[PDB]
Amino acid sequence: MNPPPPETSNPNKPKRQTNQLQYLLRVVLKTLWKHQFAWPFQQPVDAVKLNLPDYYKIIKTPMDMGTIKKRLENNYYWNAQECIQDFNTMFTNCYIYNKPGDDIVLMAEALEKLFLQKINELPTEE
C-alpha cells in the first residue's frame, strides 16, 4: 500500500515567503515542471499502480515535485534551504532505488542539471 504523502499543510509550523522561495517557485519549479522528463516526478510514487512493493521499504523519505509545488504554493517552508533539500531528496531517492543508466535515472540527471543551473542564480535574501 502507499504511505500518506509528505505533509503540505501544518498551521502551527513556522513559515515565510522570502524572495528566495519566490524564485524557487517562479524559476526553479516552473523550469523543471515543464521539462519533457518531469512527468514521473510530478506526484508521489504510486507504488501500488507501478507494482513496486519494495519502493517504500527502501525509500523512507519520499519526495516529489507535486509535493514541492504544493509546499511552495501554500507557503509551507521557512527558508530556501528546506525547499532545496526537498529537490535533492527527490533526485537522491531516484538514484537509490534505480540503477545507473536506467531511463528514470537519465531523466532525473537531466532535471538535476537544470536544477543546479537555476539555483546558481538564487537571489540574495532581500
State the residues that interact with Cl ion by CB under 5 A. 47-48, 53, 102-103
State the nearest-atom distance from the C-beta of 24 to ligand ZHV, in Å: 20
C-alpha 67/C-alpha 84 separation (Å) is 13
Residue 97: contacted member of Cl ion, ligand ZHV, none (CB under 5 to 8 Å, by partner type): ligand ZHV
State the nearest-atom distance from the C-beta of 105 to ligand ZHV, in Å: 8
The residue (of 43 and 74) whose beta carbon lies closer to Cl ion is 43
Q: Are 24 and 72 in contact (CB under 8 A)?
A: yes
C-alpha 58/C-alpha 96 separation (Å) is 8
Identify the residue among 98, 110, 119, 122 touching ligand ZHV (CB under 6 A).
98
Query: 10 Å Cβ neighbour count for 76?
Result: 21
C-alpha 24/C-alpha 72 separation (Å) is 8
State the nearest-atom distance from the C-beta of 33 to ligand ZHV, in Å: 14
Nearest to 57 by CA among 115, 7, 97: 97
The site string for ligand ZHV over 34-73 (x = CB under 6 A, - otherwise) reads ------xx---x----x-x---------------------
Position 42, amino acid: Q
State the nearest-atom distance from the C-beta of 11 to ligand ZHV, in Å: 30
Q: Are 115 and 25 in contact (CB under 8 A)?
A: no
Residues that bind ligand ZHV (CB under 6 A): 40-41, 45, 50, 52, 94, 97-98, 102-104, 107
